[PDB]
Amino acid sequence: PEDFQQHEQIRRKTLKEKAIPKDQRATTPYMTKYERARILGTRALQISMNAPVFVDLEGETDPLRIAMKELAEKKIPLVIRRYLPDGSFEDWSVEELIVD
Template structure:
């Protein structure tokens, strides 16, 4: 193709690739009333609980159940659980959650959360999933923290 032919294709001539999309382009009506859509969904008699989001992490384990019998997993807190607990608790402290230990002049939420973990006063429960789909719940007070 010659350069002249390419220039004409983008110039808006009939049969070209110009920006003449017609007069009605972009005049689509937007539905601003979500109640109309919700009423239509309710009229179709589909229960809302059947709608699953594939990105929901709970959908990966729909049949999780508590483990029966004695505990299988280690009583030691892992470095990943420790990091998650300290980070989550530090976020809570930074958002003015009540502190469960006396402060000795500390203002850093990470240091306060770490002290709470070592004194085992954090009111968290760690859920450990097992390969068979069951899980074990451990309170921070029950775990051994190094």
Template sequence: MSDQESRETYGSDDKTFEEHQEEILLEEADVDGRIKEPEQEAEKRYTSPIMTKFERAKILGIRAQQISMSAPIMVEYGDETDPVEIAKKELKEKKTPLIVLRRLPDNTYEKWAVKDLINFYD
């Protein structure tokens, strides 16, 4: 699909379909594995602090892929070699170095650190 066709299909702006979807970003980690806190104040947030099952699936998939490509692991993993299980352990211990970017109806975004989200799916 050409760029012109994608603009006609998804709207006249310069964004592609993928840019309109909910995004999960990897933020720069410190040497200690700590991530920068989202700059947004907690009282200014509009969305719920509950992680959706879709966010959980995407977080685990992205993080497992990073681990399989030799990214630093943030938890003690012992004899575990499966990247998905290591990613689940990181998520359970709230040490996943990712930021969820939620798009709001007014085309602004909210940043949520994964450690700040409540996960009911463990």
């Protein structure tokens, strides 16, 4: 059991080391088109398997058209983890990315 706890202190200390803190995020402030497609991909996979939707549907039936609508009000509760090729990452929320 202690050989797991000694193992777990490594994995948490590495992920704390890899994570770039919030003030130093030097990547782009935009939503690249590979990020927008996966946000509407995963959010439409959650609406389809009964997640709570945060908008009013207005008679839509396709789960892609709901998650397209929910991005237009910045209600999507996801977090993008932009990897750098050393291992590091920067948690950018969806609400703070300029979609274009």
